[PDB]
């Protein structure tokens, strides 16, 4: 399959990917791109309620806590609470959102407008001065 010379790797890889896409579209989606499921962003998935209130305790599991905070719908909240790293100027560092929202006793997270990603707000309160 190595015949064409000086074909840029962008072109070669896009050709392979587009071949896979068109064949999958013909076989499992009936030549219809509207049948393709749509998500906000595609990535970060490990191989392994409009108004909500969550309370952290010593015994809660961190993964379940973060999944609950993220929610089901793929959006900026999903990325904030499940993405492991955030991008610096050109570097990768631990997600400040997860480390700030790490569960602990007294932590109460109120999510409002969870259904609407644009208007969603996550207010975290902790015991301050009692």
């Amino acid at each position: 399959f190595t015949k064409v010379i000086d074909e840029p790797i962008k072109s070669i890889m896009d050709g392979i990917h587009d071949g896979h896409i068109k064949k999958l579209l013909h076989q499992y989606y009936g030549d219809d791109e509207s049948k393709i499921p749509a998500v906000e962003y595609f990535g970060g998935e490990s191989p392994v309620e409009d108004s909500a209130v969550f309370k952290a305790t010593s015994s809660t599991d961190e993964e379940s806590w973060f999944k609950a905070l993220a929610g089901s719908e793929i959006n900026w909240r999903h990325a904030s609470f499940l993405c492991s790293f955030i991008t610096q100027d050109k570097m990768f560092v631990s997600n400040p959102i997860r480390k700030v929202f790490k569960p602990s006793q007294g932590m109460v997270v109120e999510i409002s407008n969870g259904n609407t990603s644009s208007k969603t707000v996550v207010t975290l309160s902790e015991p301050v001065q009692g």
Binding site: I9, H20, Y28, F42
Partner: protein, 142 residues
């Protein structure tokens, strides 16, 4: 296998590997001397496909650091790439694994480490997985 489109409408081949890496399930493996060039690694990353910077054309942490800095300078913001290391030469690992750990500690966009020409023992693989702090570990069993 399935097709999935992001907000921009870019059709991805939805797969396990693709779902994890947020990119198409097509990668350029570490190739001495082909992927040794920082330019080719950066070009593949800009194209949007996973690529491994091969260490076989590098003999010191300084040379690898220079090449990785070249890759980082040439790629776009948020891009990423992996590093391929050969297991048959212990010197390679001895200078490369501490470098990968240091660069990851610095926050470099090293998505993964691939081990070719041999599979590490359980203890060595655990050491890599824990200390390096990569997204995933590539292994090329024979």
């Amino acid at each position: 296998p399935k097709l999935i489109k992001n907000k921009s409408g870019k059709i991805f081949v939805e797969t396990k590997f693709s779902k994890l890496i947020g990119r198409p399930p097509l990668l350029v493996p570490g190739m001495t001397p082909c992927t040794v060039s920082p330019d080719f690694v950066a070009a593949t990353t800009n194209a949007g496909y996973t690529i491994e910077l091969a260490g076989g054309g590098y003999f010191s942490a300084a040379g690898m650091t220079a090449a990785i800095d070249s890759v980082v300078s040439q790629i776009e913001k948020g891009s990423t790439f992996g590093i391929n290391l050969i297991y048959v030469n212990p010197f390679m690992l001895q200078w490369g694994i501490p470098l990968i750990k240091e660069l990851r500690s610095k926050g470099y966009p090293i998505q993964f480490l691939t081990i070719g020409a041999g599979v590490p023992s359980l203890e060595v693989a655990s050491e890599y997985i824990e200390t390096l702090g990569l997204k995933y570990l590539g292994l090329k069993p024979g």
